Amino acid sequence: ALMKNPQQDSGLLSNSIDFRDQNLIFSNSGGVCTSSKDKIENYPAKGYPYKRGVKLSFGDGTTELEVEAGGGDDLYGVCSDIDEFSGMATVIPITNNFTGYLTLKKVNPGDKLNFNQHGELEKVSVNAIALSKAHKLTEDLFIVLASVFGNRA
Amino acid sequence: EVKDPIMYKWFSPDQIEDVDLQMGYQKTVKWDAFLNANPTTIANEVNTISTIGFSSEVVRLNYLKLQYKFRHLKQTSEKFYTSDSYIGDINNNLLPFAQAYKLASSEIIKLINHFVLTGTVSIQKDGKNQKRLLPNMYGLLNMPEQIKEEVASGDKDKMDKIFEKIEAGLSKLELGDEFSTPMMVIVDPATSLKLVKPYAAASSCEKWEDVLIQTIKAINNREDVYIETSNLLKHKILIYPLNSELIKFKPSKYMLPTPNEQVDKDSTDVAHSYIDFVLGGLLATRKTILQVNIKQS
Amino acid sequence: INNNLLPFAQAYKLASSEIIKLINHFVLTGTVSIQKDGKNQKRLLPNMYGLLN
Amino acid sequence: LFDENYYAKAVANIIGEVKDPIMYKWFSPDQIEDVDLQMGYQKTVKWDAFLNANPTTIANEVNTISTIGFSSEVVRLNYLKLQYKFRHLKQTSEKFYTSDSYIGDINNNLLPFAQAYKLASSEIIKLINHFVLTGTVSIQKDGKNQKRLLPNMYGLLNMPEQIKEEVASGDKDKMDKIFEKIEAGLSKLELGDEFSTPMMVIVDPATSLKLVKPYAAASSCEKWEDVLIQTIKAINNREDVYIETSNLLKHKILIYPLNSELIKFKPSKYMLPTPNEQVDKDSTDVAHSYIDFVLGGLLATRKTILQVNIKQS
Amino acid sequence: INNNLLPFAQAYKLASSEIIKLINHFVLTGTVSIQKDGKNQKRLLPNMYGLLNMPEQIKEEVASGDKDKMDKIFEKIEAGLSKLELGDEFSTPMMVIVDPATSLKLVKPYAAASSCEKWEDVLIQTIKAINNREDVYIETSNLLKHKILIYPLNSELIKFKPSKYMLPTPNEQVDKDSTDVAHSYIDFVLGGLLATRKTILQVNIKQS
Amino acid sequence: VPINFTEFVQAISNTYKQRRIQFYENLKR
């Protein structure tokens, strides 16, 4: 449904002849431009926060802290990858900038974007700038190339 | 004494590879790469570089097992039913085991051929009331992610309009780097009759068949273009390569009819027998089959 | 397969093939772009032209 | 390799001084089998039959017969890979810290790679032993802030579908009440066919002190320990009974057999600490190394472990 | 695995074991039922009895209020042992069968508690009084539930005459079809327990 | 000469395979 790797199998072999517009898929993990000096952290995942803004959530105290999809004043980072077997979400701190495709709330380059309560980007605090128009992968799934530069009023 | 399947004519010798499976599935994994963004320029000092991503896909082929039952005469009761020339009760349509099995096998083979070509299983000439099959079981005509062209009803008798759609589909075809391979064409007999008219005051130099061969020869690196006529199709044309790397047929080694051990015996002279056959095993790459449908509204 | 990773050898071969496709596209058309539309082209130095441009 | 990699040479020459884990005393030589995995899962299949209904009397002619059904159950064991990092001194920088009595910066708490590696390995082994005994990974004394683990990863204390007894708070000091719950649990055990096997008991030090009181006036030459051994010997077919004390436990009593067919430990061959090849280096004298380990692999049958909790409140 | 189908060999072995368990339950209790409640019992022919339901025997009941008092249980056992009537066949080994809960209660020291003497030792001495100082074996069976069963091991008093076809035996009929599924049949015979009256002691410890 | 039903089935499959190979050998496209 929303997982990075579709569970439904593919009926036919793909045609690997073209080389254009073959990166706008939801399985595309990480960032478009990645530096070797980036800080990345894994955390226990509450729900499925993949390609969404994450916030720190605390339980009673018996178990450690986890990350859940969220934004606003509670935003802590951006989830760029997830491992389903271990339920670990790779989170880039807000103190580190990031450039990649992120979930957009269901928009032209240069628009100012901030994270909502569900960890989805929306048009305007300013946190990131849209680098392209919305790309639709499903009736409700919209991704967008964005570059996040931390927090600034 | 049972005739060979005609579906052997629609494939190259290397395109068919038998597998050992009655009911189940087989999986294949294909890897692919893609470019994330524009390449990074190496000037002075920089550590942020563009990325190349990878993706994987899993293709699963389903195999189904089917059975038929037919009545025949018991072996010991044959001598009381043999006649001067014919062997078997004419009034009640009862035959010995050998004759009943042979006729039944031919009928099942015809059904097997129809499924491989048309991708569906039905016993009605209308084609309705089909048997619901499993996903990942496709034929050469119902295969998804392929080029489909539809000729308007008003232009059904206009051969130029038909050839126009063929060219449009052939343009949209994508053979990649495997173009250097022969091609196969399947047409209905009505289409085959239209293909012998002079090319279009009409010309008197070449035939529509010759033009079609040349047009296909443009994209296959001037390779052989075999044309076959099948009465199964109705106002439909199929064009696809004869390369194993693009289209491969992996049928089960038990796909063709095989007798079953269980035999129903009674106090009377009538016995029953069972035949087993397996369906499935067609694999094809995306956008490598041209399917033209002439609407007969 | 779950995390879309490969051994170095297979990854390199696939990467090389895609770059060669990009090089071929530039030599013919004189532009560098990944979109099928052709927009968002990489800004190149002058005196860099292909056959079509 | 030892010529080029000093750290590899250092580990090999110091690996012999690392003490063995104490968890080995809780099992038998046949109860441990190594598997070749770091992270992932392994599966096993077990078949069980059952009777649908009462048998059918064979009288005269009958076609409808009672049926016997079958079922299959798959048990999956998960393995997780963990890692720790520690800071040490650069190999060439030791000579500027080799004091007369010791080597290492006492003011900044820096040690050579060899001594740092040994102490770090010792701490990790302590963590591994705690997990197997209790099933949880934590560093707080209260046992909170536990690292969330994958399902199908359990220890001898948290294994589900076992016999669990809870001594009330008011009877925490009453050894007879404690023994009453133990006997009730021992009855509820379901060793079944596998009973001619040695048994193992693990208790906290406070419990071990209570076990040497005279059995209750007072019974001369009879102590609660002797009563317990006899009671366990009743159900184990007069086999050996071993008693162990662990500071890790607290007001817990654990009884389970030492049979490979009921409880089997299949740890990864890389479960114990191992150095990583990646060594962080800088211009300064401080370097970093990584040690990784693997957790998981405890398989046991239902209702074959007695778990007693002495509630304090 | 999906359809729960097995080869004939493995299917047969599992089926045989379940039947043997059913046979063992019947021999001890004299009833055939698959519910843990002991209901919906198969209606059997008369003169078909087990050790726990043999009629005209000595039956003792311990009150529910004394379910955990070993002295009260031993008191009822002693009364039952007195009422036993072995007569001529008294110099014979004896057999005791107890539930696991009762078995644990036995191993506690005899009671200001004594020493070097368990309730089990006292019970063996008590039985040895009436069996002419003969062997007294004790067995624990999970099939029982708050029941103590005492009976001699002499063929003159209690005998078992099972059929030679009591244990499971395959049938020769196998249902075959066009599919891959076949059906098989297993046969077993029940009955053959003979015992003299007033030679079995059955103690039931009432639970609440 | 087959022994049981299983060998009979295998012989049938081999006959079909050799029949198919022969057909391509004799096929003239």
Place this chain on the structure above:
Amino acid sequence: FVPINFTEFVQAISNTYKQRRIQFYENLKR
């Protein structure tokens, strides 16, 4: 014994742990 590379070194470590565990149980008397 001379490890050729880090992978062989890791294998030697695992064998050493296994042998040490085996030796521990052999010397254990309970």
Place this chain on the structure above:
Amino acid sequence: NFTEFVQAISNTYKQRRIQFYENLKR
């Protein structure tokens, strides 16, 4: 035949229980 097979089974069961008591020790 099957009849001899069944008798062998019953004989086999008897031998097993005879052997069981021989090796049984209380």
Place this chain on the structure above:
Amino acid sequence: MKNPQHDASLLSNSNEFRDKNVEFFASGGTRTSKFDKLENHPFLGYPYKRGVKRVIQHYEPHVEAGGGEDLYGICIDIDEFSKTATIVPITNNFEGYLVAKDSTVKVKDKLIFNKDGALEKVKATINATALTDAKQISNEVYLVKVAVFGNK
């Protein structure tokens, strides 16, 4: 679904032989005759251990859970890979465990298949008799032993 026992954490103890057959994975009937007619049909939904009805639309007819005056048969087994359901026709009689509407089903009660394929207490169209009481194997699932014989 049908066989959820594949997801397990520890081995089960195979010693007790009682109260071990009342399970959702037990497929078929308690007592089965060699001369029982079985038909397999494509299914749409989860008609396992339910009364089924024929649905006709193009494609061949398929069976789905149902009852009332539309009852055609009873599903006793299901194959997920082939998406086929083994059905005992209403003409043939059956004895086994079937799904009940709730836990208010007792012995000696006359049952009726509802529009959802579940058995409920009661005129009546078919002869279904509850041989036991409903067992709460799951929060919403209620298996009951029922002998079905013809229609009224």
